[PDB]
Paper text:
Beta-N-acetylgalactosaminidases (β-NGAs) hydrolyze the different β-GalNAc linkages of various glycans to modulate the length, combination, and abundance of glycans. Despite low sequence similarity, the crystal structures of these enzymes demonstrate that all enzymes share a prototype structure and have diversified their substrate specificities (oligosaccharide-releasing, oligosaccharide/monosaccharide-releasing, and monosaccharide-releasing) through the accumulation of mutations and insertional amino acid sequences. The overall structure of these enzymes is similar to that of CpNga123 and BvGH123, which consist of a β-sandwich domain at the N-terminus and a (β/α)8-barrel domain encompassing the catalytic region. Among Groups 1–4 and GH123, the DE motif is located at the same position, suggesting that these enzymes adopt the substrate-assisted catalysis reported for GH123 MR-β-NGAs.
NgaP2 was active against GalNAc-β-pNP and had weak activity against GlcNAc-β-pNP. The NgaBf, NgaBl, NgaLy, and NgaP2 activities were similar to those of GH123 MR-β-NGAs, as they only degrade linear oligosaccharides with β-GalNAc at the non-reducing terminus. Moreover, NgaP2 (Group 4) has two loops above and below the cleft from the second and eighth β-sheets of the (β/α)8 barrel domain (blue). The increased number of residues could potentially reinforce substrate recognition in Group 4 and GH123 enzymes. Additional structural analyses (comparison of crystal structure with AlphaFold2 predicted structure of NgaCa, comparison of apo1-form and apo2-form of NgaCa, and comparison of GalNAc-thiazoline-bond form and GlcNAc-thiazoline-/apo-form of NgaAt, NgaDssm, and NgaP2) data are illustrated in Supplementary Fig. 13. Using GalNAc4S-β-4MU and GalNAc6S-β-4MU, we observed that NgaDssm, NgaAt, and NgaP2 acted on GalNAc4S-β-4MU.
Author numbering: 18 to 576
Write the structure that this text describes.
Amino acid sequence: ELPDFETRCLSSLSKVFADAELHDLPVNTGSAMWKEVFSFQVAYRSPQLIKSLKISAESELEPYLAIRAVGLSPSELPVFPNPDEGYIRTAPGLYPDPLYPLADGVHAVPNQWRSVWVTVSLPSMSEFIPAADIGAESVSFPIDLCFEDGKGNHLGAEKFALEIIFQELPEQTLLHTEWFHSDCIATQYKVEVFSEAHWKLIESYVHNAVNHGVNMLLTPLFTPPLDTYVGGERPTVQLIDVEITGVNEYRFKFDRLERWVEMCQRLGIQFIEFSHLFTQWGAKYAPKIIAKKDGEEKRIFGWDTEASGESYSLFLDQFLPQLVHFIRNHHLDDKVFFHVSDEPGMKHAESYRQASDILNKHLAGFSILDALSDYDFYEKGLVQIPVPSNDQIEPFIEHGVEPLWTYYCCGQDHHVSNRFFSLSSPRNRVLGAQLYKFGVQGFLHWGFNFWYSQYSKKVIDPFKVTDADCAFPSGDPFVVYPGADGPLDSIRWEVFREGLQDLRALKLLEALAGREKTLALLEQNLREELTFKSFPDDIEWLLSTREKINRAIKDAYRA
Ligand SMILES: [Br-]
């Protein structure tokens, strides 16, 4: 006689822990637009150990549907000291995060809730395979999920009803970069940088990025000078070929950059974000730069070459005009961004100025972006486009700074949206609504796939170490895991795309009904105005808000 077995259908916004009771309420309905990725999960529990469950879905949406297992990752540093009351947990342990192919095997483990995650990637209406009335406002499709043991006995089932609203979620216009660490791919898969095997993996990772709303890619002219200790290095990742012809004299080749840019174009990246040309913590030094003299490679710049020295000045006087010629020849003039150095403090205003001044002699007319969360520094007029943290953005909104950009990282641990393991899925997804309300033009994140320790002192295994060796709250350094042939998603990466989908849906309702009505619907029944710091951290609020937006779109009078 069969083991006992229970199921509960849930939204994408639950995190099901294997060591706790499940309080979440069942969710068996939702709505979506064409070209939207709609996700849900089913939790299940048995008192027995049941190995290699057979899980299947039956739906007209089967061509668009994937099922994955929600795996557990360790976190030794889930929180910084004194986590606010909105954290879902504070103790080290195992957290639901990675999403594994079902082919990898799925088990019921005694008296533990586990989950399977369902992704429905909807096409355009014109590509949809099932018959659907082109004149309907929406059509509902059942999705039935079935659990059986290894030997074909039925254990459980859940039915989900997805309503597809017959309008398209419009193309994303928000600029969105998640810094891509090519080096981390090379060291994890054990391939040489810019080998053909490395290029193939790069393509897989970029494809995943684009699919999750990344339209701007960090482009390593020289080894990005990021997360490296003073006097330290990361593996050489350098698209520019440099030949030393004599003292302070160079020649350049851009053929590997041209390969990179063509890859970007082909995979759907729209903007090229060139890597920083000076070090972190005040732009005092050059990046690591490698050059050939007489066939042989040597390091010509780095932590022993001051950024304000004439040597690095003369190098950029030769390089930058040649990069500008490349840009113009490839019709990239309005598609590029440059970086100086992030978050210069007031004590570094002078070194930042001297660095920024070098670029300004050559890069007139181009967008130059830098993380900058201090409005008093911004008033000095040294940074062109500031990228303030979402916990520091208030004075940039108050003063009408344009274009408005935001980021978050490990430092944004209080109140605001983030993507830590120990934070709820609503506190991730709500970013979409905040971006909408404040008219943000771009969002930046440092950690697509950062798989080293703090300061890149060692390589870590991201399946075992999720906090960069007790430096950053787990979830901060990476949203993808290394699968055998390409990325594995986290539930947090799926939920972040949902926030970008909410932004796109809000902008659609704005096109149909205007901004005043859209913003009023979004803030209906809130006790406090929506800000980057103040929102309901609540599954029911967010789901019912997006459902209202969808119904208002469905009901809108259309041209
Ligand atoms: Br958008």
